[PDB]
Design an enzyme around this catalytic site. Structure first.
Site, PDB file in Angstrom:
ATOM      1  N   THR A  99       9.547 -65.575  43.497  1.00  0.00           N
ATOM      2  CA  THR A  99       9.295 -66.087  44.837  1.00  0.00           C
ATOM      3  C   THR A  99       8.162 -67.105  44.821  1.00  0.00           C
ATOM      4  O   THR A  99       7.306 -67.081  43.943  1.00  0.00           O
ATOM      5  CB  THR A  99       8.940 -64.954  45.824  1.00  0.00           C
ATOM      6  N   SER A 100       8.168 -68.005  45.802  1.00  0.00           N
ATOM      7  CA  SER A 100       7.128 -69.020  45.963  1.00  0.00           C
ATOM      8  C   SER A 100       6.697 -68.990  47.426  1.00  0.00           C
ATOM      9  O   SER A 100       7.440 -69.419  48.311  1.00  0.00           O
ATOM     10  CB  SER A 100       7.626 -70.398  45.545  1.00  0.00           C
TER      11      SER A 100
ATOM     12  N   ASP B 177      10.015 -69.540  49.929  1.00  0.00           N
ATOM     13  CA  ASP B 177      11.401 -69.704  49.526  1.00  0.00           C
ATOM     14  C   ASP B 177      12.246 -68.572  50.108  1.00  0.00           C
ATOM     15  O   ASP B 177      11.747 -67.671  50.783  1.00  0.00           O
ATOM     16  CB  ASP B 177      11.515 -69.738  48.002  1.00  0.00           C
TER      17      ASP B 177
ATOM     18  N   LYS C 134      11.400 -64.121  54.112  1.00  0.00           N
ATOM     19  CA  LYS C 134      10.276 -63.461  53.467  1.00  0.00           C
ATOM     20  C   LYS C 134       9.020 -63.453  54.322  1.00  0.00           C
ATOM     21  O   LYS C 134       8.140 -62.615  54.098  1.00  0.00           O
ATOM     22  CB  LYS C 134       9.985 -64.132  52.123  1.00  0.00           C
TER      23      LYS C 134
END
Lengths: 200, 211, 202, 207, 194, 183, 220, 183, 194, 207
Positions: free
Chosen positions: H1-2, H17, H33
């Site tokens: 994840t970013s 993301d 998220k």
């Protein structure tokens, strides 16, 4: 650790124109005592060798060094000296670097030419001027020798010192004891003495 | 730990103690955080330097401020001869660390409590996650225990060397050790905090000192 | 063990402590850790040395040239890679200081490596003289001796200068001489009980 | 360690060694391996001395409490049962030796597994085999007190000689109906030479 | 296995347990764990199941080859040295022999009995009496008490009988009795009625 | 470590940090990580293999003439396959970069980055790299990238050593922390 | 791992009218020196000196809890002096209170028995204790006790000319002679043990009270 | 994840993301998220704890009024201590970012990045972040940063979801790969 | 331990090995691994060292308490059910009893002997003859051949004697003989001359 | 698996079961576990069936080579020694059974650890205890050929009944001085009922 399987200790000391080498006589199988006549000190000419550790290794090394020193005497027409014998022991031990004998060898002797007392410990040579210890009670021996030893002891005083050190270190070691032998080595004579000690 | 603080170095001079630590929180080999103050003044006569787990260090910071608040309750001399001593703070911290270890939930830190007692004696004692405590003329944690301590012990080798050590000499040795630690420690920082507790001039806190 | 190597303006100096340990027990209090590969190439480690020196001497006799520190370094590197040292010396190409491989103006290995490096980092400067280099290496070894349990006893120093013979200063400093014991523990003769006595025919 | 206790017409002979070893290092040659639980009860330690020492001392407290309530001393069967139940619930070898009017001379063996055995002869420790053999070859019920004390001495001497972790000295106890009697500490080194001289044994040992 | 050896004034007596056990059952109760190396040398062995016999016949073949080649008998000391060398070679081989042997022999030139105890590692020692493994734990007290250098063969046999009785009472296995052999100047003979 | 090689209009520049660590201890902080295997072929690790490669390339130069960077990478692979960045200049190829990651595969790239510090500068180098950069532009790009890598990687630091491989020759450049840290 | 080793060796010798408890002052971790003067022998009041050797944190806790119990004993028995045997029993109960998570320490207490003779008690980490004439603890115990046995108890020594039939008779060692032996044994241990050095602190318990003596050891 | 949160002149923007993976399998590629724990306090992980925090913050709001972003991070810590990026806007604090890495410590930063893709943009975000950015500059900064993170991280991808927390309110922004990949 | 049980026309015969071994030595050679639960019920047990006796006296106390409380004797079936439940409880407790028991009893109301074999897990089964562990490996062949429901007590003892002889021959252990007890309408009695 | 071989006045009786199991799954009920090494030699397989089969066929080849060279058949001792050396050099239980003029009827037991035992009775496999007991209870040297065949049948039947991994059928072999004779395959299911009917055994089995 195969060195602690059989037990036993060897101590060497330098005196005034003399060396002493001493060992216990216990041959053990873990806690069980098998033999009280397993002398760990051997001599090849005037050079004395004490071997602690695995007893089968002790016998194998004694045979190997008798072999090598006999061939040395035949080739050189002279007996090997303690310093040369120390080099021989070091090279023989490192010849089995990854197959090592589980031993601690102690060299004692007087050089026949110079007359200076010589002792050595070990492949890396510890050519001490005072004392060498080896075996399961090496810490007890270190304490006793560091406390008792003084330089330039006469042969009688050297005998008393090394005997007391050996006896009191063996008293505090479970796998050492069952008698002791001391060699007082001089250029002219070598005296072998059996010590009275606890038989437990 | 996960986010970790590096060495804290300290020594005592003739009139007090000096303690230093850098302002960096490492994340493994990542130099993640650069504003972590790891010297904690407690009152005006005590500085607590913490190394190791930063989250556990923030917990100890909370425990120290609660201890100050509790001491002032019903105590008209809390700013006076009934204030918290460096020995009181250390004993509390040592008790907490030892009780945490005995519960198998240790505060993963090494703490040095630096300060001057009310009678004027220098206080410099160490405690770690195991509850192991000792005092010395010079103290260091982590990497400084191996590299900074030899340089500081060259200035104060024993207790009789403390009265011969001036604040200028002690601070010069501490700054030199911090520079050396920056050179040879990968989890260290150029920026560090320095606190001087003097029995005469009191607590001097210097921030953002640079190697 | 504490070994340092410091290069100065006309050579390189290596120094070591003399303590050997078997666990927490000091086996040899005066072990010599500065090993000579060739007259002007010396090694210190934290058997391979003796074999490398033998082959270096044979190679020097074969080529009729002075041994090179790069040759000893290459030999040690290949031998150890087949199956941690500081190698210093002076050859016709100058003074050299290697560790096994990184070069350095100063180096330190062993248990006391960090204390010695602290002293070096604090006091090392470019263009040291021979006396200053000896002082710095000795101080690094002394720091290792005082602050590391695995280091102790004496300081051995070897100085290799470009135009001069190497000088091995065995026990250059002896800062740990035991004080005189409180009492003499000489036993009176006859104290030990003897079961049997015999002369050995050597 | 070698501990032995055997039953004879004169009561119970309890003989122990006194060597404690930390690996190959002999920490002490003067360790008491017999708990004097009370003037009429003896316990022996062989491994787990701290659990033995604490609980057999606590066993004396329970006997004293039983003394006050019932106006009668606790039995060896009860004392061993309490110790056996204690050992089982925390799951060493100990001999509980006593001589009460009802039971007579009684020895109970309790080990760490929770076993509890009554018997006439017991040997525990690293040298128990050497002690067992000397007892098995010389034990008699009609044995006299002097001959039984020597038999306890001799059995420990064999163990001390042959076993590396047994030695130091022999502590002799004699449990009688009037309570146990301590018969002293006998250095194994001195004892061996005396026994070698008088008995003619240990011919392989040079003297 | 249980192997006892005892050297008396004029002979060496060897006792070897009779039981062979593999897993759940005692397969044999009359095994002979001895090999005659020479007319005046006997070797009894104990240890791992397949290693003992293999090593024993290898040693016996070598000693027989020496005897035929030289038309002479090796002394018991020389035989014990050769066996010790073989065991010391094995202990550091690809797979060692886990064999403990007692060598009892009569030196026809010294006119003296000899007993040698060699374990699997290769520790050789000359003993007046010996046993391998746990066997000495139940016998050494009795021999230390009653052994004398000048004992006759009958007294040695009585001492061995007492040792075997003690082993049967306190050792926790059933070794199914022992086979007793005597080596002296007249050769090697077996005692059936033991 | 932070090592990075960039092909540009006149050749290739190899840049690296100078820090080697054993855990948190900086054992050497003046390390020379750019290694010459042939005259104008240089490599960097992310040491014995370098010696064998130099041996093989010297043999190749004696027997078959000057090797190319591709030949050096081929030898590197045949030794490793049975993290290396190989950079070199040849007249016909005008500067080539070959990366050999830990698996032993060989990739020819306009620029390569390797080491524990390259991860922090993957995005920056993707955004900022341009083909046919000038020599000064390439030096600036490597300086900025390695400065960021040193800032974020604990195992990267010391001076930034650069080797410029062009037709002119080999140029050695050194950049101290007081210069690149303030970038 | 909740435990650790901080080195330190302690020696308790009981004379006929004195008891000495000596320990080196060096505190270590692995191969580093934490402190060159960290005393491990403590006067606990009532002419009782205690030393808890082993894990330093458990040593501090046990000594703290024993000093705790002495104060409670004075609170409950009207400042009555605690006898050394009563203290030994109290320490046994303190140690056994953590039977399954023990204080990883071997502790020695020294003092005078109610008859006035020197008393020394040694304790197992689990709680077993025994009164001794002498006991050494710590890493260098094996380098110190064999020498004292030879020099205090005259082990393996015989009267010359008696052919080893008459042992050298035991003698009264004064506290000054015992201190000389303690100093020499510790200087010998300092030579050959890397964990021994930096200073020797000896606490002497007599009828007069507790006396402390410090001697410098080698600092390498 | 970013995931990244950036404070700017009018407040804070949280960007993430939309890819969740189980190894190499993208199980969900439209994941949301960014999670709301309070009205203008949002958090992101690098799910039970978010429910307890929202429970505690709702309890705080009924009794003690509107909590601040520090209070949310305090509640997050007291549950985690006994990787989270907490971003929120308050009138007096004008937008705050709190990062709580895996160890459980809390740090207040002008901007935070977390996740497997954050490592690739440590260099880029350090060079390009500026204090007091405009709303469009901040969105551009997050768009450029996450796109590089998505490019290099296999666990990052999908759409770039953004939550803008200002005094005006909460604004939801979505950026599809066809837009940010070409940046 | 070795426990055999055999139910004959009018009685149950139990045989238990006499040896106690802890480690290197056989401590006891006359142990009785049985407990009288009631005047017409006997329980013999085998298994782990301290668990067997501890469980047996716990069972015996409970059965005695029921007898006093009700002034009545539990049937052997009821006794075996109670023992099975206790073993079944233990197997999932903090530390189970590793005890295998044979329950032989005489039902004074049915006037029939009963034998129950219960293992440590709590597996109860009524058997004409039973043995625990490896004991049945050396006995079942003989009982499968010669057992009859109508056998008298003497024939059961002769069959039991033959079973013990095979165990001594082929098991690799020395259990030092067996103690034989008989449960019938007259109570529980012991056979010393076995 | 249960294999047995015993020596009697009429030669050697070799009886085996025929069940092979892969865990709890019975792969085959018709496995030959007796190797006809040559018309005068038999081998038995009990564990390690493939090594046994290959090496005993090779043993037969070696026996044929010895026959050709020395004009004399190999001895049972020699074949057992060869097989034991082979097993040891690669370090199962196999019986080598034969009847030569010099040795007479001879059985050698060779197992995987290298042991090689001569004897009159052997039983190997999971059911070796039941068959071994049946033999020990009924074996005689003066046993007749028919009685010996029935004894082998009965021992295998006991093993198959009581042991889960033994069963299927009994293969009987009779080694005589003229060579071995196969006495057929006997289904264990039918054999059990026949023996229960004629013998009165297995009274606990309802029929």
């Amino acid at each position: 650790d195969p060195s602690s399987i059989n037990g036993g200790i060897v101590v060497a000391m330098t005196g005034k124109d003399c060396v002493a080498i001493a060992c216990d006589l216990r041959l053990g199988s873990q806690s069980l005592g098998v033999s009280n006549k397993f002398e760990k000190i051997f001599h090849y000419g005037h050079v004395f060798l004490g071997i602690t550790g695995l007893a089968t290794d002790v016998t194998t090394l004694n045979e190997m060094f008798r072999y090598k020193t006999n061939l040395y005497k035949l080739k050189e027409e002279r007996a090997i000296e303690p310093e040369t014998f120390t080099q021989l022991v070091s090279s023989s031990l490192y010849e089995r670097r990854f197959g090592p004998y589980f031993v601690g060898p102690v060299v004692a002797g007087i050089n026949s030419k110079s007359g200076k007392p010589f002792i050595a410990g070990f492949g890396c040579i510890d050519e001490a001027k005072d004392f060498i210890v080896s075996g399961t009670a090496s810490d007890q021996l270190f304490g006793m020798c560091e406390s008792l030893y003084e330089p330039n002891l006469e042969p009688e005083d050297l005998f008393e010192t090394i005997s007391q050190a050996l006896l009191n270190a063996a008293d505090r070691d479970a796998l050492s004891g069952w008698g002791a032998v001391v060699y007082i080595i001089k250029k002219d004579e070598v005296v072998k003495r059996y010590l009275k000690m606890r038989q437990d | 730990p996960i986010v970790t603080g590096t060495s804290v170095i300290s020594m005592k001079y003739d009139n007090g103690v000096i303690i230093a630590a850098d302002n960096l929180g490492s994340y493994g080999s990542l130099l993640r955080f650069n504003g972590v103050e790891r010297l904690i003044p407690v009152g005006d006569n005590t500085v607590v330097g913490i190394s190791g787990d930063i989250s556990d260090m923030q917990h100890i910071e909370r425990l120290l401020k609660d201890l100050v608040t509790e001491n002032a309750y019903d105590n008209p001399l809390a700013d006076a001869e009934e204030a918290l001593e460096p020995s009181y703070i250390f004993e509390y911290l040592a008790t907490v660390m030892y009780q945490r270890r005995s519960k198998m939930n240790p505060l993963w830190n090494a703490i040095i409590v630096a300060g001057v007692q009310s009678n004027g004696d220098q206080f410099l004692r160490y405690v770690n996650l195991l509850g192991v405590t000792y005092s010395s003329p010079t103290l260091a944690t982590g990497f400084g225990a191996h590299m900074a301590n030899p340089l500081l012990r060259k200035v104060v080798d024993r207790e009789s060397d403390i009265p011969k050590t001036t604040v200028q000499v002690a601070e010069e040795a501490i700054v030199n050790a911090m520079r050396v630690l920056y050179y040879r420690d990968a989890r260290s920082s150029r920026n560090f905090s320095l606190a001087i507790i003097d029995k005469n001039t009191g607590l001097t806190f210097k921030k953002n000192l640079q190697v | 063990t504490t070994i340092v190597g410091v290069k100065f303006n006309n050579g390189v100096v290596i120094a070591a402590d003399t303590r050997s340990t078997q666990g927490p027990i000091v086996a040899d209090k005066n072990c010599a850790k500065l090993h000579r590969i060739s007259p002007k190439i010396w090694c210190a480690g934290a058997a391979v040395t003796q074999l490398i020196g033998s082959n270096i001497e044979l190679h020097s006799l074969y080529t009729s040239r002075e041994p090179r520190v790069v040759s000893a370094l290459q030999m040690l590197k290949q031998h150890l890679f087949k199956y941690y040292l500081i190698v210093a010396g002076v050859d016709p190409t100058g003074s050299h200081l290697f560790s096994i491989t990184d070069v350095g103006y100063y180096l330190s290995l062993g248990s006391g490596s960090l204390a010695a490096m602290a002293v070096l980092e604090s006091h090392w400067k470019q263009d040291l003289t021979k006396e200053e280099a000896i002082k710095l290496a000795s101080d690094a070894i002394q720091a290792g001796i005082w602050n590391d349990l695995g280091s102790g006893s004496n300081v051995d120093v070897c100085v290799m200068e470009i135009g001069k013979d190497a000088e091995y200063l065995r026990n250059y400093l002896t800062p740990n001489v035991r004080e005189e014991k409180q009492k003499s523990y000489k036993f009176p003769r006859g104290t030990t009980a003897v079961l049997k006595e015999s002369i050995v025919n050597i | 360690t070698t501990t032995l206790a055997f039953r004879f017409q004169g009561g119970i002979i309890v003989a122990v060694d006194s060597r404690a070893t930390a690996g190959n290092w002999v920490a002490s040659q003067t360790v008491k391996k017999v708990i004097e639980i009370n003037p009429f009860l003896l316990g022996t330690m062989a491994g787990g001395a701290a659990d033995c020492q604490f609980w057999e001392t606590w066993l004396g407290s329970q006997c004293r409490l039983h003394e006050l309530r019932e106006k009668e001393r606790i039995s060896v069967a009860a004392a061993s049962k309490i110790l056996s139940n204690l050992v089982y619930q925390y799951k060493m070898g100990t001999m509980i030796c006593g001589y009460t009017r009802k039971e007579g001379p009684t020895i109970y063996y309790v080990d760490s597994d929770g076993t509890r055995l009554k018997g006439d002869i017991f040997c525990v420790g690293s040298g128990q085999t050497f002690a067992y053999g000397v007892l098995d070859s010389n034990y008699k019920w009609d044995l006299s007190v002097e001959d039984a004390l020597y038999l306890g001495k001799r059995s420990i001497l064999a163990a001390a000689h042959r076993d590396a972790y047994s030695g130091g000295s022999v502590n002799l106890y004699h449990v009688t109906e009037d309570g146990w009697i301590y018969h002293g500490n006998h250095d194994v080194g001195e004892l061996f030479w005396k026994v070698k001289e008088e008995e003619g044994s240990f011919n392989n040992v040079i003297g | 296995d249980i192997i006892l050896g005892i050297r008396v004034q004029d002979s060496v007596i060897l006792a070897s347990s009779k039981a062979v056990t593999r897993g759940i059952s005692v397969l044999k109760d009359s095994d002979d764990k001895t090999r005659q190396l020479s007319p005046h040398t006997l070797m009894s062995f104990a240890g791992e199941a397949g290693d003992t016999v293999q090593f024993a016949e290898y040693i016996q073949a070598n000693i027989q080859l020496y005897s035929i080649r030289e038309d002479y008998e090796l002394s018991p000391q020389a035989v014990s040295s050769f066996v010790r060398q073989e065991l010391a070679k094995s202990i550091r081989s690809r797979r060692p022999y886990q064999v403990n042997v007692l060598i009892g022999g009569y030196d026809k030139k010294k006119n003296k009995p000899e007993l040698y105890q060699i374990d699997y590692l290769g520790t050789k020692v000359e003993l007046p009496y010996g046993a391998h493994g746990y066997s000495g734990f139940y016998t050494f007290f009795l021999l230390d008490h009653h052994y004398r250098p000048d004992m006759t063969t009958e007294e040695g046999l009585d001492l061995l009988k007492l040792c075997v009785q003690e082993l049967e009472k306190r050792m926790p296995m059933d070794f199914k009795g022992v086979i007793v052999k005597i080596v002296d100047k007249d050769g090697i003979r077996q005692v059936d009625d033991f | 470590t932070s090592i990075m090689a960039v092909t540009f209009k006149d050749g290739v520049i190899l840049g690296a940090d100078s820090r080697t660590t054993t855990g948190a201890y900086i054992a050497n902080r003046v390390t020379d990580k750019l290694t010459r295997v042939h005259d104008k072929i240089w490599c960097c690790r992310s040491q014995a293999i370098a010696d064998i490669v130099q041996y093989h390339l010297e043999l190749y130069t004696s027997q078959y003439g000057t090797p190319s960077t591709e030949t050096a990478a081929s030898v590197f692979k045949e030794l490793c396959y049975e993290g290396i960045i190989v950079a070199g200049y040849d007249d016909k190829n005008k500067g080539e970069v070959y990366t050999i990651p830990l698996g032993g595969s060989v990739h020819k790239l306009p620029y390569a980055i390797a080491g524990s510090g390259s991860t922090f500068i993957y995005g920056y180098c993707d955004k900022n790299f341009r083909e046919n950069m000038s020599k000064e532009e390439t030096v600036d790009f490597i300086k900025h990238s390695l400065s960021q890598a040193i800032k974020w990687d604990g195992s990267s630091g010391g001076v930034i050593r650069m080797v410029v491989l062009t037709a002119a020759g080999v140029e050695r450049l050194i950049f101290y922390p007081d210069e690149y840290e303030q970038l | 791992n909740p435990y650790g080793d901080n080195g330190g060796t302690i020696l308790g010798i009981a004379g006929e009218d004195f008891a000495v408890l000596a320990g080196d002052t060096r505190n270590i971790t692995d191969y580093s020196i934490n402190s060159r003067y960290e005393p491990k022998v403590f006067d606990c009041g009532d002419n009782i000196v205690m030393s808890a050797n082993g894990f330093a944190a458990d040593g501090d806790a046990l000594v703290k809890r024993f000093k705790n119990s002495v104060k409670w004993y004075h609170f409950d028995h009207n400042d009555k002096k605690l006898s050394i045997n009563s203290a030994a029993r109290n320490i046994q109960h303190l140690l056994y209170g953590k039977r399954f998570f023990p204080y990883y320490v071997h502790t020695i207490i020294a003092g005078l028995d109610e008859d006035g003779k020197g008393a020394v008690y040694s304790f197992d980490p689990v709680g077993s204790y025994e009164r001794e004439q002498c006991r050494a603890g710590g890493a260098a115990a094996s380098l110190i006790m064999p020498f004292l046995d030879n020099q205090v108890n005259f082990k393996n020594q015989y009267e010359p000319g008696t052919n080893g039939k008459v042992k050298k008779p035991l003698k009264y060692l004064s506290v000054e002679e015992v201190i000389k032996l303690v100093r020499d044994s510790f200087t010998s241990a300092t030579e050959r043990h890397i964990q021994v050095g930096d200073g020797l602190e000896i606490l002497i318990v007599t009828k007069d009270g507790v006396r402390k003596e410090f001697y410098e050891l080698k600092r390498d």
